[PDB]
Write a protein that binds this ligand. Structure first.
Ligand SMILES: [Cu+2]
Ligand SMILES: [Cu+2]
Ligand code: NA
Ligand code: NA
Lengths: 620, 620
C-alpha cells in the first residue's frame, strides 16, 4: 500500500472510465500526457489519495485541458481550459509524427522540389521535428511540426545516409495543412549507404571474442517488495516511472545503524535539450526538448537479456497510457542489477603487518529510449560507500546533412558529400534534496590559493572557502574547474559526532553549457542550460526547468520565473537543478552508427557519516 | 627474441656478475636503481643489445656512479661519477628507511621529547620521509631523511591514529647522525584507535552480499606470447615493468585491416608528487615524489585472486634487483583481464525496422603499490572502439596530525583531536606519441562561441578552432574547461579517406594543478605540475619530468630545462606530458581507512579510422 507504487493497468483504465463518465474523453479527444502525482508534503493523512494529472488534446481544434483525477475516490478534481498561445502547446502525439510525411507526399510544392532532384516520392522519408518559436507569426496558437527529408533506397536502408539538403517544410498537424515549403537549392544526395548490418560494409565478423559469464548463483543481494521498493546494502528507495521524465527515484535513504536517514526525496532528469549549431536556414531552428516535447518515457525500449542488460537482471515493466486512455505495458523497460566495481579500500601496513582489501559494488537502475535517430541511456548508480551517480549514454545515428563544397565551420564531414552538423545534448537533473530531513542549505566550495609570506613562509599552504547560498537571487551558479569548485548540500540542524553539519558534495564534470547567443530563441526557452547550478525553494507546481508546456512556448518559463521569487533557501526545503551536457563535434568514427559517449555527475558524502560507512563489508 | 621482453632473473644475475668482475660492486656498494634501457630509435640493427642502466650507492660516503652495462656482450659501457650536490641524490634505499627509527631511539633530544609527553620509546614508530630542499645549508651533498612520530599501542595497532604533533627530526642516513630535533610544543596524542579489523569498531559484518561470479569458460580473448606481448581485439602492445615507473606500455598499435598502425610508442606515469598544504613548521617541508624518490615499482603488491583482481586473470610476475644485485620476483605483481563495459552502440530504427545492439569490453592492465600509509592503483584500459584510458585509484590511510584547538584552515578533523592535513596527489603521464608513425603534431582545440548577426541571424551557431603548437616555447598549455579545451595529436602526413590528417584527442579531467606558491621550493622541483600539458621533441635522455635524480635536487631540472631548447615539434617525433591530480580535503568518511577516489585521462580516435572500427563486432 505504498503511495509511491507504480501505476497499474487498472488505475489507468479507471482514469479512462472516470474521464469518459465525466464527458471529458469523447471520440475527438486524445491523452497527450498522463502520470501519477507525488503525495503532498506531510503524508500523515492516513490512506493515500492516488491522483493523476492528465493533458487532454482535442483533434477538432477545441482548447485542450489540464485535468486532475483521483482514482481512490473516482472523481475529477479539477479541469482547466488551456490558452496554448500564451502558455505553450501540449507534447507531441505519436499519431502526429506519421502525419507529416503523408501530407507532404501530396503537396505540389514538395512534389516539385523532389522532381527537380529526380527523387521518387515513395522513397523519401520525412523526419518530423518539433517546431520551436521563431519569426513566423501565423504559427502562434497552432500545432506545428517541421520536416526534413531523407532518401531510403529500399525498405531496409538507413535513410540517415541520404539527407536531402536545401529543403524543409512546415506542417499544421491539426488542420492537416502544409504551411510552407522552403527550397534554398539542390545539393547532391550522398550515395554511400550507411547499413551497419550489411556484410559488405562490416566485413567478416570477428571470431576472437570469448564469452564473459556474469552470474549470481545465490541470486542478487537486493530485494524488491511492493512491486518497486528496493533495499540493497543499506540503501532504500522506490523506483518510479513517468511517461515524461522516465525513471524517477523516490525516498533515497541510507540505513545508518538503527535509523533510516534520508538523502534525496526525488531525483529525475527533468528536461533535455539538443540544440544544433548550423546557421543554415534549413536547420537553424533545429532544437528539441526530448523530455518536455516528446516525452522520453513513452519511447523506452524493451531491454533484452544478454544484449542490453548482462548479468542477473531484475526487470520492471512500467505501465503508461496510450492516446485513448488504454494501458500499455513497456515490457522489460527498466533493468536493475548489481555489478562489481573493483577495489573499495586497500592498505598493506608495514608496522601492523595487517593486509586489508575489500571489493566495491554498485546497484544499477537503467532504461533506454529512442527518438528518431537518437538513442539515450539513463543510468543511476548507488555505491557501497554512499556515492550516488548518474550517467547519460548517447548513441544512435548522427543527424546528417550535405557537406558543402569548400567546407563548413559548423558541420563535419563523415563520408564523401555527407556532413553532420555540430550540436549539444544537455540534461537537467532535478534533485529534491532531503539531507537528514528537509532543512537543507547549499554552499559553494572553492579551492583557495595562498601567497608566500608570514604564517606560510615556505609557500606551501592552501585552503578552501564555502559560501552559503541564502536566497534564490544568488543561487544561479557557474562552474569553475580551475578552482575545483563544488557544491555541498548540508543540514545545519543535523550534526555528525564532530559537531559539524552533515552534508553531501556534488561533483560536476564542468563541460561547456549552452553555447547559443544569449539573445537567441533557444537561450530564452532553454534558459536553465545557460548555468551549471540552480537552487530553488520547493513548491509542488515547480516540476520542470522549462515549464509544464514546452512545445512551442516563447521562453522564460520555468527556472528564471521560479528564481525571481527570491525565496529563502538557507535551511529550507530546497531543490537542486544541475545542468550538464555533451558538446558533440561528430567524428568519422561516429559513422555509420556511433559508439557510446557519456556525461553525468555524482554526489559523495561529506561529513554525513561518523566514519567510513563500509567498515562492515566482509572479505569474501 | 623481442627487445621489449621483461628482464629475466638471469639478466639481473649477469648484470651483477659483470659489475662484480669490473670492480664496481664490492661489499660497500648498493644498487639504488636498475632497469633495462629502451632500444634506440631505428631498431634496424639486427640482434638486440640488451643494455641496463644502474645507479650505484656507496655506503661509506664515496661518490655514487651511473653505470650502463650490456648483458648481450657482458661489458660495462660507461661509468660516470656523480656530483650529488649539483645534480641530486640517488633514490631512497629500502634499508635506509629502517634506520631513522633506530638512531632516534638512542638520541637524547628525541628521548627527552618523548619523556615530556610520557611516551614509551618502544611504542613510537617513525615514518621516514624524503627530505626535499629548503634552507638548511648543512644538508647539501648529504643523504637525509626526515621523521615524524606515531604511537603504536600494541604490535597490531594502527599507528596513524596516534600522531605525535609538534615533533620532527632530521637524520643523516649515511653517517648515521641525528642532525636536528625540533620540538615546537606538546599536543595531546589522539586516543581513539583506528583499527578497521577490530569487531568493536566494525560491528558485525554484513551477511547481505551475495557472490558475483565472473568466469570465462573458454578462457580470455587476449593472448600472451613471448612472456609479455599482448594481442586483444585488434590491439597489440608489450607490457614492460620498470622499478621506478612501474608498468610501462610499449608499441601500442591497432590492426586496421591488413596493416598494423602505431598509436603510442611508450606510455608511463613518469612522476608523482604529493605536496602538503599545512603551513606548520612540523610538516611544511612534507613533499614526496613517490616515483622519482622512492621508486613505486619496487613496492608493488602481490595481487590476490578474488580480492585484488576478480575474473579470469592472467598474471605477470616482474623481476627486479635488490640492493646487492640479486634478482627478486614480485609474484602476481601485474593483473590483466578483460571486463564487460556495457553498451557499445545501439539504435532502434523505425524506418528500417532494424534493431541493433552491441556490447563493449575493455582490456585491463593494473598493479598496486604501497608507500607508508598510501596505496595507489595504476590502471590502463583499452577499449573496443580505439579508446585508451588511464585511471589512478588512491586509497590507504590518510596522513594524520593533531587537530588544533580552535580549528585550522589547512587540516580537517576526522576524530576527536585527530586531524588530516590538506594535500594533493599529482601524476605526470609521459606519452611518447607515434600516431601512424613518428611525424606528429599537437593542436589545441577550443569551442568557439559566435555572436548573433549576419550569417547567424538566429544566434544558434557555434564552432571550434585548432591552434598548432609549432615550437616547444609555445607548448606549455593550461586547461580551460569552460571552452571545452582538448588537444589533438595528429600525423600531417597520414590522411584518412576524407583526406584529413589522422588523429587522437586527449580528454583531461581539468582538475586543479599544483596549488603551492609559484616561488616555493616545491613549485621549483615539481615544475611540471604547474601546467596541464607539455610537448617536447623526443630525446633519449629526457625520460622524467623532474630529471634523473629527484631526491634532494634544488629544482628546475627536467621539463622546464627540456622546453628551453625551443625545438621544432610540428611534424616531428614528439612526447606529450600530461599533469593530472586529485586535491584531497580529507573527509570523516576517509577515516579510519579511505574508500578509493580516482583521477585520470583518456585518448579517443579523431579521424584516425575511415569509419567506426567496431562494425565487425558480433551480437552474442
Ligand atoms: Cu550527438
Ligand atoms: Cu590523499
Ligand atoms: Na527538498
Ligand atoms: Na614520439
Amino acid at each position: 500500500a505504498s503511495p509511491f507504487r507504480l501505476a497499474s493497468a487498472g488505475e489507468i483504465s479507471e482514469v479512462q472510465g472516470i474521464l469518459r463518465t465525466a464527458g471529458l474523453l469523447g471520440p475527438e479527444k486524445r491523452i497527450a500526457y498522463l502520470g501519477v502525482l507525488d503525495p503532498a508534503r506531510g503524508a500523515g493523512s492516513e490512506a493515500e489519495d492516488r491522483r493523476f494529472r492528465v493533458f487532454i488534446h482535442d483533434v477538432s481544434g477545441a482548447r485542450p485541458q489540464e485535468v486532475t483525477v483521483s482514482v481512490t475516490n473516482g472523481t475529477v478534481i479539477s479541469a482547466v481550459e488551456l490558452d496554448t498561445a500564451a502558455t505553450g502547446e501540449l507534447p507531441v502525439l505519436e499519431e502526429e509524427f506519421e502525419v507529416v510525411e503523408q501530407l507532404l507526399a501530396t503537396d505540389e510544392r514538395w512534389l516539385k522540389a523532389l522532381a527537380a532532384r529526380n527523387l521518387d516520392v515513395s522513397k523519401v522519408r520525412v523526419a518530423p521535428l518539433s517546431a520551436g518559436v521563431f519569426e513566423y507569426a501565423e504559427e502562434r496558437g497552432r500545432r506545428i511540426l517541421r520536416g526534413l527529408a531523407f532518401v531510403q533506397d529500399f525498405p531496409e536502408d538507413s535513410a540517415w545516409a541520404h539527407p536531402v539538403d536545401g529543403l524543409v517544410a512546415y506542417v499544421d498537424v491539426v488542420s492537416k495543412e502544409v504551411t510552407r515549403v522552403i527550397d534554398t537549392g539542390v545539393f547532391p544526395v550522398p550515395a554511400e549507404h550507411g547499413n551497419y548490418t550489411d556484410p559488405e560494409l562490416t566485413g567478416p565478423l570477428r571470431t576472437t571474442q570469448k564469452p564473459i559469464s556474469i552470474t549470481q548463483p545465490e541470486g542478487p543481494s537486493f530485494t524488491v517488495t511492493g512491486g518497486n521498493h528496493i533495499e540493497w546494502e543499506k540503501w532504500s528507495l522506490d523506483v518510479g516511472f513517468d511517461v515524461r521524465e522516465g525513471v524517477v527515484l523516490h525516498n533515497i535513504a541510507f540505513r545508518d545503524g538503527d535509523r533510516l536517514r534520508p538523502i534525496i526525496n526525488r531525483a529525475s532528469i527533468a528536461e533535455m535539450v539538443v540544440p544544433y549549431g548550423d546557421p543554415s536556414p534549413i536547420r537553424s531552428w533545429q532544437n528539441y526538448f526530448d523530455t518536455g516535447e516528446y516525452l522520453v518515457g513513452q519511447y523506452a525500449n524493451s531491454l533484452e537479456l544478454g544484449c542490453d542488460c548482462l548479468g542477473d537482471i531484475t526487470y520492471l515493466s512500467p505501465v503508461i497510457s496510450d492516446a485513448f486512455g488504454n494501458p500499455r505495458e513497456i515490457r522489460n523497460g527498466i533493468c536493475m542489477h548489481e555489478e562489481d566495481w573493483g577495489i573499495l579500500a586497500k592498505h598493506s601496513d608495514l608496522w601492523s603487518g595487517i593486509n586489508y582489501t575489500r571489493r566495491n559494488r554498485r546497484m544499477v537502475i537503467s532504461f533506454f529510449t529512442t527518438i528518431g535517430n537518437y538513442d539515450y541511456g539513463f543510468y543511476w548508480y548507488l555505491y557501497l560507500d554512499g556515492t550516488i551517480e548518474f550517467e547519460a549514454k548517447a548513441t544512435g545515428v548522427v543527424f546528417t546533412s550535405a557537406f558543402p563544397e569548400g567546407g563548413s565551420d559548423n558541420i563535419s564531414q563523415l563520408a564523401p558529400g555527407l556532413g553532420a552538423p555540430f550540436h549539444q545534448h544537455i540534461f537537467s537533473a532535478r534533485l529534491d534534496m532531503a539531507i537528514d530531513g528537509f532543512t537543507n542549505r547549499v554552499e559553494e566550495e572553492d579551492v583557495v590559493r595562498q601567497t608566500m609570506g608570514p604564517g606560510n613562509e615556505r609557500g606551501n599552504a592552501f585552503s578552501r572557502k564555502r559560501t552559503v547560498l541564502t536566497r534564490e537571487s544568488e543561487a544561479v551558479r557557474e562552474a569553475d574547474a580551475r578552482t575545483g569548485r563544488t557544491w555541498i548540500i548540508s543540514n545545519p540542524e543535523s550534526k555528525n559526532r564532530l559537531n559539524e553539519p552533515v552534508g553531501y558534495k556534488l561533483h560536476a564534470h564542468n563541460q561547456p553549457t549552452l553555447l547559443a547567443d544569449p539573445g537567441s530563441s533557444i537561450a530564452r526557452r532553454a534558459a536553465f542550460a545557460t548555468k551549471d547550478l540552480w537552487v530553488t525553494r520547493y513548491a509542488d507546481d515547480e516540476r520542470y526547468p522549462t515549464g509544464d508546456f514546452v512545445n512551442q512556448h516563447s521562453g522564460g518559463a520555468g527556472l528564471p520565473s521560479y528564481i525571481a521569487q527570491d525565496r529563502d533557501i538557507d535551511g529550507q526545503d530546497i531543490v537542486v537543478w544541475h545542468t550538464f551536457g555533451l558538446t558533440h563535434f561528430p567524428r568519422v568514427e561516429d559513422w555509420p552508427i556511433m559508439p557510446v559517449d557519456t556525461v553525468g555527475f555524482k554526489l559523495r558524502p561529506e561529513g554525513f557519516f561518523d566514519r567510513s560507512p563500509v567498515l562492515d563489508v566482509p572479505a569474501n
